[PDB]
């Protein structure tokens, strides 16, 4: 069990850690988060009380270093940092733990929600989507645009998700125009899976990461990517049976976790109605279709 200590909390802020969140009052006795489960990526995220504009946060994996948060009063945000002096970091955390100034990652034993949402998400791939190589953790916020969004403006601050475009030469083989547009299997299996992602695990990892950035930061380009990656599978007549079964599990837990009152802005009516009721895989997503129909029957 690892710890993301905080030097202090000088401004009032709602802090999230994965799917949990709590309020910290200005100058309240806060020194961080303990008992963080090892083996998963995690995200620690922030919304200031005085400006709900800009949710922002950091993806990290405690196996890759010792990380702490300190408020920067010049740039006006909580920043993650890496302490290289292991001896000093472990020593400081112990004093904070002794003073009972750290909140406990509040995981119920029965509960596999976080695993299920991050099963295929690896830090190494996050860092290729979010490029800032001098750090072991990755900053994301509500406003960051995607590379594809920038083709339709600061490159160093972009989300380099894999570009998916159904009306592109990459997606459409010469002489198979109708076939490839109406049945996207070539684009899914040859171009994307064999060619770019190499395997379905990396595809699902990017899909899961896009969903989580959409949900936690309201990142619009990430929501676009999530839906595009769903639609590419659902619009393919030929998908490996294990990928369909896994997709149904992935989406089930995403829909289960989605806050009810954010569905209107995080769910695309066309994609979901097409995926569940018109597409080749309209009958392959039993768990997802059942939770969608019982939780969001208006959208459909």
């Amino acid at each position: 069990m690892n710890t993301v200590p905080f030097t202090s909390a000088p401004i009032e802020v709602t802090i999230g850690i994965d799917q949990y969140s709590f309020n910290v009052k200005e100058n309240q006795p806060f020194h961080g988060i303990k008992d963080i489960p090892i083996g998963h990526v995690h995200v620690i995220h922030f919304q200031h009380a005085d400006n709900s504009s800009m949710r922002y946060g950091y993806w990290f994996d405690c196996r890759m270093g010792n990380f702490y948060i300190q408020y920067d009063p010049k740039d006006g945000l909580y920043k993650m940092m890496e302490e290289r002096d292991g001896a000093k970091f472990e020593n400081i955390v112990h004093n904070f733990k002794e003073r009972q100034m750290m909140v406990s990652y509040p995981k119920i034993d029965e509960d596999d929600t976080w695993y299920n949402l991050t099963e295929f998400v690896q830090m190494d791939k996050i860092r290729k989507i979010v490029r800032k190589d001098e750090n072991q953790f990755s900053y994301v916020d509500s406003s960051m645009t995607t590379v594809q969004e920038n083709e339709l403006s600061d490159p160093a601050h972009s989300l380099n998700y894999t570009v998916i475009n159904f009306k592109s030469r990459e997606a459409i083989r010469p002489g198979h125009e109708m076939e490839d547009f109406l049945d996207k299997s070539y684009y899914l299996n040859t171009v994307m899976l064999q060619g770019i992602f190499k395997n379905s695990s990396n595809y699902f990892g990017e899909l899961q990461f896009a969903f989580l950035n959409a949900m936690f930061f309201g990142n619009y380009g990430s929501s676009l990517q999530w839906h595009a990656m769903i639609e590419l599978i659902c619009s393919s007549a030929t998908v490996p049976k294990h990928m369909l079964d896994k997709l149904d599990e992935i989406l089930y837990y995403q829909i289960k976790t989605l806050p009810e009152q954010y569905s209107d802005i995080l769910l695309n009516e066309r994609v979901w109605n097409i995926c569940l009721y018109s597409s080749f895989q309209k009958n392959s997503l039993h768990n997802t279709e059942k939770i969608m129909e019982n939780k969001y029957p208006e959208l459909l």
Binding site: K167, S168, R169, I172, E177, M178, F181
Partner: protein, 237 residues
């Protein structure tokens, strides 16, 4: 964006453009089988691709053999249309290729866009206009060449005859659309109007009769009456 009444003069500027109408590509007769079921029988069709500034009509004849053994023919017809329009553009010299292709039905947009990915600078546009190009198969010489075809064939027609010698392409298009609307609203009346006087003939190399300017005014007036007439006969006004 979309082409409509407000931006109508754009049709006659000097940017090459084509209208594509797919209405008459997939044509069937519906009939009873011996068992009393219903079946379709295809007949030859055509793509109507028109340069509205010059009157150049590229009439690609769609022979019924292209449907043999194929499924979902109404959907295939849109993709076949887009394949043939794409082939036509590729066949033209660069300086003759269109800068815009306007499709008369919105369901042609995605098929044509996909077939034209190699031409990212050619705009594919819809229209809000209800253009009467379906009635091209009521022009006798066009109908004849489509029905006589035994194989796929491209036939070339100037749909304005020699009108541009005497009128502008705005006025020619307006005449064409009036004639075709009339033929679509009441084919028999419209054809009676056009061919009632045996002394005005259709030249061998033309589609329409050789009316004088004065006779065209009368003709156009009679076509407007007809479209009002039938509009009352239909709506009881």
């Amino acid at each position: 964006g979309a082409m409509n009444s407000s931006n109508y003069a754009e049709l006659f500027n000097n940017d090459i453009k084509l209208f594509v109408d797919d209405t008459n590509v997939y044509r069937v007769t519906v009939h009873k089988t011996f068992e009393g079921n219903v079946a379709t029988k295809a007949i030859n069709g055509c793509i109507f691709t028109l340069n509205p500034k010059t009157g150049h009509l590229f009439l690609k004849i769609i022979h019924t053999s292209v449907w043999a053994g194929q499924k979902r023919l109404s959907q295939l017809a849109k993709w076949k249309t887009a394949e043939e329009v794409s082939a036509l553009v590729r066949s033209l010299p660069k300086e003759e290729q269109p800068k815009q292709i306007i499709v008369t039905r919105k369901a042609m947009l995605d098929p044509l866009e996909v077939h034209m990915l190699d031409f990212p600078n050619i705009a594919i546009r819809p229209t809000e206009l209800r253009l009467p190009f379906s009635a091209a198969m009521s022009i006798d010489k066009l109908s004849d060449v489509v029905m006589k075809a035994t194989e796929p064939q491209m036939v070339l027609f100037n749909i304005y005859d020699d009108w541009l010698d005497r009128i502008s392409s705005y006025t020619a298009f307006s005449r064409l659309t009036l004639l075709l609307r009339a033929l679509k609203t009441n084919e028999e009346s419209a054809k009676m109007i056009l061919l009632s006087d045996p002394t005005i003939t259709i030249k061998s190399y033309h589609l329409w009769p050789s009316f004088t300017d004065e006779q065209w005014i009368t003709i156009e007036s009679q076509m407007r009456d007809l479209i009002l007439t039938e509009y009352g006969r239909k709506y009881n006004v």
